Every structure is written in structure tokens, then in C-alpha cells.
Design an enzyme around this catalytic site. Structure first.
Site, short mmCIF file in Angstrom:
data_model
loop_
_atom_site.label_atom_id
_atom_site.label_comp_id
_atom_site.label_asym_id
_atom_site.label_seq_id
_atom_site.Cartn_x
_atom_site.Cartn_y
_atom_site.Cartn_z
N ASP A 94 4.02 -49.94 -34.89
CA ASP A 94 3.10 -51.07 -34.88
C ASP A 94 3.88 -52.38 -35.02
O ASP A 94 4.91 -52.42 -35.69
CB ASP A 94 2.05 -50.96 -36.00
N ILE A 107 1.47 -59.74 -36.51
CA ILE A 107 1.84 -60.94 -37.25
C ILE A 107 1.11 -60.95 -38.59
O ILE A 107 -0.08 -60.65 -38.66
CB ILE A 107 1.49 -62.21 -36.44
N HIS A 108 1.83 -61.30 -39.66
CA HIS A 108 1.22 -61.41 -40.98
C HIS A 108 1.71 -62.67 -41.68
O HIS A 108 2.69 -63.29 -41.27
CB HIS A 108 1.52 -60.19 -41.86
N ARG A 109 0.99 -63.03 -42.74
CA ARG A 109 1.41 -64.03 -43.72
C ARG A 109 1.63 -63.33 -45.06
O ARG A 109 0.90 -62.40 -45.42
CB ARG A 109 0.36 -65.13 -43.87
N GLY A 119 -8.30 -50.79 -41.42
CA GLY A 119 -8.39 -50.10 -40.16
C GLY A 119 -7.22 -50.31 -39.21
O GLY A 119 -6.93 -49.42 -38.40
N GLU A 133 3.69 -53.74 -28.39
CA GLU A 133 3.41 -55.18 -28.35
C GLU A 133 4.60 -55.95 -27.78
O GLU A 133 4.43 -56.87 -26.98
CB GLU A 133 3.05 -55.70 -29.74
N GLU A 141 -7.28 -71.35 -43.79
CA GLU A 141 -7.70 -70.36 -42.82
C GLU A 141 -8.01 -71.06 -41.50
O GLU A 141 -8.25 -72.28 -41.47
CB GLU A 141 -8.95 -69.61 -43.31
#
Lengths: 491, 491
Positions: free
Chosen positions: A163, A166-168, A184, A230, A286
């Protein structure tokens, strides 16, 4: 041929007002974001704000060896330049790369600039908090954040299952980050599997990348063995495989040419309050334009190493503003394109995942009624959009003579091509998105819990039978340029 | 001190991109408008278009001694520079002048540049059509038009009653113009009184004026003996009376410092079809952005003389796009301001007669809820707006943290601070405006005749009880200039 972040900065420097540097000292805590708010954050950030250059801060207080890049993706025109296409076709051009991906390949350490410097957390002197300037976007945030961390991870039972997302991450300690993982999604399922067996999950966080990688990784991808699929979009966009290298401290791959790689493990059976160090009650801004709430129970990456290039750039974002509009909005548009065009070929002229909804909440669909039977397909195109992207909230439908990237012209269609008791259709009680603060029971008696919404279709297309009365005033076609050449130079 | 159009131009020339000249030959028939469509028509004009400089064409095919000015009021920022105030305050500023007008004065012919050249219709060689260029906006217009004609006129029995109004006029022959006059307006009632007595109505059409005069003439004024009271607004904006000169061929006043004055009389018992020379079926582009139909029965001005300055400028407009938004939108805003502020002082923060509605159809009201009892006053403000300007169609209500002149930010409020089945109120069957082509029985079962509408209020304000959840992410206040001086130096 752009293969990493610096190749992209070089391309930007060949166009005016795409890249900007400053040597004036800036504090990563609050100040840097406050500056970029004015220069180029854009999107849903509070005014005043604007589209501007990507910006490099060379002089970061307390971090004499660091420099911070923001805004790389924070313009549609800029993203188009970095991928070599027209900004109106950006969603379709990437959608073509999605269809013919080029697989990444593994290189040796000798070929990975991201490992020119290795800082093992072993070292007694290691301190993630002093090695890396993680910016704080607003004073009420949960703490310092990295906001463009491309996470690589694999299933702990089936190593061929991979996998890329993108994350923070919030910086929580000398060698700890908290990381929110969507329920999920693949990497959370990986983590839940490892934790059920009492084991950590190895992971790399890769920051400072070719914008093709960041953009490509926001699209859904097929899954092949060991595929990191990806990355195939960027491989297609550059016609060169993205290069992976083995982590030095964890058994997981990292992006070979990335600027900074944080290697670590998600800990089994451990959780933290996101804002444990500030009690601000908030996480960070956000995409809808509001500060989210602090997550009370988050998993933790225990850092085993940070590797980086010499003179590593730390790349993040501010707003998240227009930068989020680009990363989220192009996938929103592509999936709407794909769904409408397969169901109603030739009808949709274009679609815009409007920046006012951060690239997720608001879809503008430009259709063309070609024949009597197209009456009634404009609603069908709206249903297709709402079905294909469930985080959408409202749809605005316009004809092919309305500029969907021009918000004045959208409101014009909403003024002269719309009757409130005819053209507006409400669909109550549909799950939308919890970060829309109007999606709550307190806002509406038809909403049963947070993240449920009424979804509204504003049909601003001319009814088929009335089209003869709705021609826009026909000004004559002229090349204006010979009349004021020097003025049209400013482009 | 600005006291004519040329002083205004010289002011514009001190600021960048406010005034542009071209010597490229241009056809006043269709081509000129076609050029300015791309450069600065703006407003509801079909894309591409934009706000740009006011434009002077010096090289006019078929008119070697003429030059044509368009776009003088086609920019809110340009109007503000011209009146010496901030764009966001424009309507408040003109509203102060409306309240304390400075009456005009009569001067002798020697103080009247507008009579530097006299062209009596007496002369067998007189021909209105070859003397002055009258541009056409599109190829399908009724004919050549003057679109910024300031009419001065008096009652044929009680000479103490006067009027000052802006009209458009189609050139109908050697010495005839058609002119539509709005029913019940003072100058039309003067005309009917004169026609009912079998007598012409003397009149002057004044063109190329201090923008203060055109802007001020669009506001309602009181009537006082021999008042020409609309000129009192320009008088107060300049703190210097507007000057009037006795006409040379008709018993009526003209603007002393106008570029061009057409002196004539409205003829009794005579009508012409507006498009009698083209049979185009159309008049010209209307402010909602569609072509108007040709009026089949217009009164005629028989021209008795044309006077002008040396090197006279012909001033008109294109689109009518943003030039109409300014001229019509400032009165719309001022009247909403006055009604809401009198009824709910302190509650309205600002109002925008949005350009997508040509300054008339769409109102953006910016309110501030200060206390619980303001919940429910936002809708009250909307009703005040709908009550005082009946040609409005829709209202959008936002809070004081939404930039109402930024259509992206309006749509943002429409996305995160709105639920379709709660925030949208339809009011059907209210007379609106005939030039909104969707106001017909064919668009809506609730519309009983052309020019009747459903009027919709979109409440995009945060409910009082929920305000703490809707704070825009608070990026810190920072002075961005020192970080990028030369970049901010492009202001």
C-alpha cells in the site's frame, strides 16, 4: 525528465511566479504557515489569501541546517506545468496514466540519495524533535505535523500485499509520531492484523517527492504482487519507473530519491491522545477550512531511523488550501469523468472538483444537451457523480458556455438559468463527511448522526425546449492581441 | 481636482493597468466591442473576459478625427480610485454624497468646453451618422448605439421640474435617434405631457463625463426647483458644483465640460421600430448577458445640433458587463445598506450587488451575529433587501469572515455552512425583472407571467448556537512583506 523533487523545483524556476525562496528567518511554529497563508495557501484558507508560487524557506529558527518547502501542488496551473499538460485536462491526463501504469523497480542503496545521511534512533543523541522542523500550522494545533508523508507498508501475513498512501503525522516525542489511519483502508487493516498478533508493523514515511508521485498516489490503483501500484501512475507520467530502496532499519521499502525518509513501526497495543502535549482540543486545519478535533486514541510510529539526502528539503503544505484541492480534486474529477462518460458518452464536457469544497465536497459538471433526449440526463449525470464519489455534498450543473473554473460565471448560471422551486433537488440523509461541520444532527432535523448530509443538486442548465432564448450575447470573434501587444505580454 | 473626463483619465494614467490606448485601426461596428470583450468588458459577458484597463481607441475606421473610450466604470477598483475611496466602501461613500448633495450651477458659454465646436443640424451637410461613431456591441444589434447618454430634460409646463437620467440611443438617420424611456420616470412624464399637447420636448444628451456624474446619476434624488438634483451627488463627491451651460439650439441645459452634447427634441406622435434598418430582431446586449429584443415602438429625438470639445472623445460601454455592474450595483447596495442599517443598526457589515447579476439580480449580504437575538435577523435582512430592491432575484447571506467580493468564498459558505433542506427558502410568484430569461411561465409552473420569479434566500450563516464549531482555521497574523519584498512589490 523530472525524477525527483529538485528536478521539479528546477522546472518551476523557468516560469515566473511559480517558485519563490526567502532567507528571512522564520519560525516553523505558526509563523511559516502564517506567511504562506498570504503568499499562496489559497483554497478554503481564510482571506486574505491567493494562488502564488511554491515557496522555500531557507532560514528556519532553531534548525540551522534545514529548509522547508510548501505549496508545490497548491495551484492547478502549477500542477499542469509539472506534468506537462493543460490545466483544464489535468484530470484526464492523469487518468490516462492510471490506465497504463509503469511499475516501480528496486535499486541498491548506492542509487538512493534518500540514504546519503542515516540517523539511527539507536543513537543516545537522536531526537526527532530537533532533527526535523515539523511546522505547526496554527497555534491551536495538537502539535507539530508532517503533512505530506507518503507511507509505504505491507500486510504482515501476505508480504505481496502492499500500500502507498499520503498521511499526516504529529510529532509526539523524541522517537514517536501519532498517525491517523482511515478505517477500512489497506494500511490500517495491515496494522490491525499485526496488532492482533502482538507485533509491530514496519512502515516508511517518505517526504519530499516528485509531484507526479504525490499526485499519482491519490488515485485508486489495482493491486499486483509486491506492486506498490500507486507508484505506477508517476511511472506512467514520467515514462520512467519510480525507484524503491530497502529500508536500512526496517524490512520495508522506501522511495529511493525522496528527500527524507522516516523508518519505524506502528506499535502493538499502544495509543496516545493526539493533543497530549498542548490540550488544545484540536488536531490541525482540515480541507473544509476548519481545525479538526484532536483524535483521543491514535496509533504510534516508533521511529527506528531517519535517512535523508544532503541538504534535505522538508516538504509539507499549508492550509491545506489549494494544495489539498489539487491532490484530492483530480481523483474526484477523474472518477466523475469515468462514470459519466461510460454511462452517457459525449455528454459531459468537463468537471471541476471545486476548490471551495477542498476538491471533495462540491462538483461542478459542464454538460451539453445535443438533442431532445438529453433533457433529463443532466440529473442523471449528477446522480452518477454523487454515486461515484460519496464524499461529495452538492452538485452544480451548467451548460457548455459557462466557465466552470470561474466562480463568477457559476453564480451567473445560478442567477439567470435557475428557478429555486424548480431547479433545486434535495436528497436528505446521505452519508457525506464528518469534517463538514454542518453535517450534524444539530444543523438539521433530517440528519441522524455526524457526517450525514442533505445533498443538493442545483440544475443550472437551460431546459432543452427553451434553449433558443438563452444564447449568451454574441460578441464578434477578434484577435485582440494586435490592438495591445505589450499588454497581452503579461501572461 | 477632477472636474471632467480628461482629468479622470489623467488620474488613471498614474496607476498601472487602469488606462490603455491603441492606434490600431478598429471598426466601431462590432470589432471594437469584440476587442474589449477580451481586454476588460467583464461582468456577465461570455468567457473569456476579465477586468482590465479602460480603453481608448484613437484610430476609428470611417472616422479619422474620432477616438472612442470604453470601460471607464468597468472596474470596482477603478471606480474607487476615481472617487478617492476604498472599493469595499464605494457604496457607503456615494451614499454619503447622496445625503448631502452640492447643487449644480449655470456658467456662461465661455466656461463651456462642450461648445468649443458647434454643428447645427441646419447645415445641409449635417449627418449624425458620419459626424460621430456610434459603436455596435454585437453583429445582431438594432443599429449603432450611444450607451452612456446623460439626458437633461424639463417639464414642458412647469419648467421648475427637471430630470437627469442615463439612456442608450440607437442612431436612426441623418438627424434622428430612438430612445427608450422608462415608464413613470420623470423625463417620460415630461415627454407624455408635451406629446399630449402636440409639442416636442427639448432635451440634451451629454456624453463623456466625470465618472462621478455618471455614478451619481444612477442614484435616486429628491426634486427641488430647477434642481437637476442627480448632479448634486457628483457635486458632493467632488465638493465642487457640476456646471451647466445653456444649449445653443434648444431651450435646455447641457453639461458644460462634457465631451459631446447632442441637442434635440423628442418628437410628438412619432414612433420607430428600433431595428428598422437591420431587421435584426434585437436591440443590444442586456445586463443579464443576453441580447434584448428590439423595441417596436420607440420615440424619436430630432437632432438640432451636436456640440463637442476639440478633439472630442466618444465615451460608451461594452458588454455591458462590469461597467453596468458598477453603475447599477452601487445604487442597489446603497439602498440595501440604508434599509438594513435603519432597521437593524450594526447588523449588516457590507453588501455586494454581485456582478454575476449585473448589479441587480443577486445580493450577497454580510452580517454579524452579535448576540442570541440576532439569530433570525439574517433572514430579516434578506427580506429588507428583497423589499427595497424589487428587481433582486436571490439573496445569499454570509457571516463577517466570508469575503463577499470573492466568489470562491461565497461558494465555500454555500458548501460548509448550508444544508439544502434547511437553509434554502423559496418565495414564489414575486415580480422580478423581464430581462431574466428564466422568469417565464415556461420555466416554472408557479410563474404566471414574464418577469415574475421565484426568489430564493440561501442562508449561509452559521446558526448562533453552533458558532464555536465554525471558526476558520486561525493562521497567525504575520507581516508577510519582509519574507518576499520584491514579490509583494507587484502591487
Amino acid at each position: 525528465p523530472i525524477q525527483d523533487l529538485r528536478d521539479a523545483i528546477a522546472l518551476l524556476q523557468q516560469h515566473d511566479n511559480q517558485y519563490l525562496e526567502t532567507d528571512h528567518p522564520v519560525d516553523p511554529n505558526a509563523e511559516l504557515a502564517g506567511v504562506y497563508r498570504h503568499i499562496g495557501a489559497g483554497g478554503t484558507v481564510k482571506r486574505p489569501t491567493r494562488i502564488g508560487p511554491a515557496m522555500m524557506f531557507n532560514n528556519i529558527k532553531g534548525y540551522p541546517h534545514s529548509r522547508i518547502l510548501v505549496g508545490m501542488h497548491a495551484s492547478r496551473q502549477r500542477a499542469a506545468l509539472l506534468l506537462g499538460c493543460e490545466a483544464s485536462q489535468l484530470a484526464l491526463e492523469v487518468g490516462k496514466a492510471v490506465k497504463k501504469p509503469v511499475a516501480p523497480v528496486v535499486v541498491p542503496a548506492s542509487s538512493a540519495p534518500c540514504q546519503e545521511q542515516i540517523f539511527l534512533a539507536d543513537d543516545p543523541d537522536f531526537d526527532l524533535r530537533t532533527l526535523l522542523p515539523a511546522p505547526t500550522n496554527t497555534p491551536i494545533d495538537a502539535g507539530p505535523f508532517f503533512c505530506l508523508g507518503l507511507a509505504l507498508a505491507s500486510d504482515p501475513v501476505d508480504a505481496s500485499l502492499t500500500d502507498v498512501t499520503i498521511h499526516r503525522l504529529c510529532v509526539q516525542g523524541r522517537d514517536e509520531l501519532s498517525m491517523f489511519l482511515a478505517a477500512g483502508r489497506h494500511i490500517e487493516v495491515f496494522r490491525q492484523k499485526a496488532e492482533a498478533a502482538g507485533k509491530p508493523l514496519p512502515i516508511t514515511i517518505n517526504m519530499g517527492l516528485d509531484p507526479a508521485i504525490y499526485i499519482g498516489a491519490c488515485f485508486e490503483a489495482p493491486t499486483t504482487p509486491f506492486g506498490y501500484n500507486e507508484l505506477g501512475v508517476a511511472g506512467a507520467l514520467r515514462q520512467r519507473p519510480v525507484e524503491l530502496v530497502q529500508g536500512v532499519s526496517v524490512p520495508e521499502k522506501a522511495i529511493a530519491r525522496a528527500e527524507i525518509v522516516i523508518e519505524g513501526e506502528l506499535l502493538p497495543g499502544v495509543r496516545v491522545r493526539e493533543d497530549q502535549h498542548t490540550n488544545s482540543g484540536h488536531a490541525m486545519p482540515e480541507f473544509p477550512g476548519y481545525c479538526g478535533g484532536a483524535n483521543p486514541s491514535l496509533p504510534v510510529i516508533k521511529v527506528k531511523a531517519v535517512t535523508m539526502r544532503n541538504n534535505a528539503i522538508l516538504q509539507t503544505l499549508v492550509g491545506p488550501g489549494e494544495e489539498h484541492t489539487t491532490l484530492a480534486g483530480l481523483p474526484t474529477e477523474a472518477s466523475i469523468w469515468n462514470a459519466v462518460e461510460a454511462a452517457i458518452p459525449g455528454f459531459l464536457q468537463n468537471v471541476y472538483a471545486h476548490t471551495a469544497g477542498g476538491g471533495k465536497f462540491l462538483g461542478i459538471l459542464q454538460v451539453k444537451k445535443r438533442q431532445p433526449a438529453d433533457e433529463g440526463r443532466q440529473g442523471q449525470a449528477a446522480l452518477l457523480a454523487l454515486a461515484t464519489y460519496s464524499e461529495l455534498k452538492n452538485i452544480i450543473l451548467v451548460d457548455e458556455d459557462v466557465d466552470i473554473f470561474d466562480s463568477d460565471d457559476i453564480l451567473w448560471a445560478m442567477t439567470t438559468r435557475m428557478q429555486g422551486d424548480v431547479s433545486i433537488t434535495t436528497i436528505p440523509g446521505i452519508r457525506g463527511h464528518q469534517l463538514d461541520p454542518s453535517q450534524t444532527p444539530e444543523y438539521s432535523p433530517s440528519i441522524r448522526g455526524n457526517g450525514i448530509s442533505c445533498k443538493t443538486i442545483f440544475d443550472c442548465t437551460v431546459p432543452w425546449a427553451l434553449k433558443s432564448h438563452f444564447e449568451r450575447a454574441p460578441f464578434a470573434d477578434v484577435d485582440p492581441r494586435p490592438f495591445a501587444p505589450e499588454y497581452f505580454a503579461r501572461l
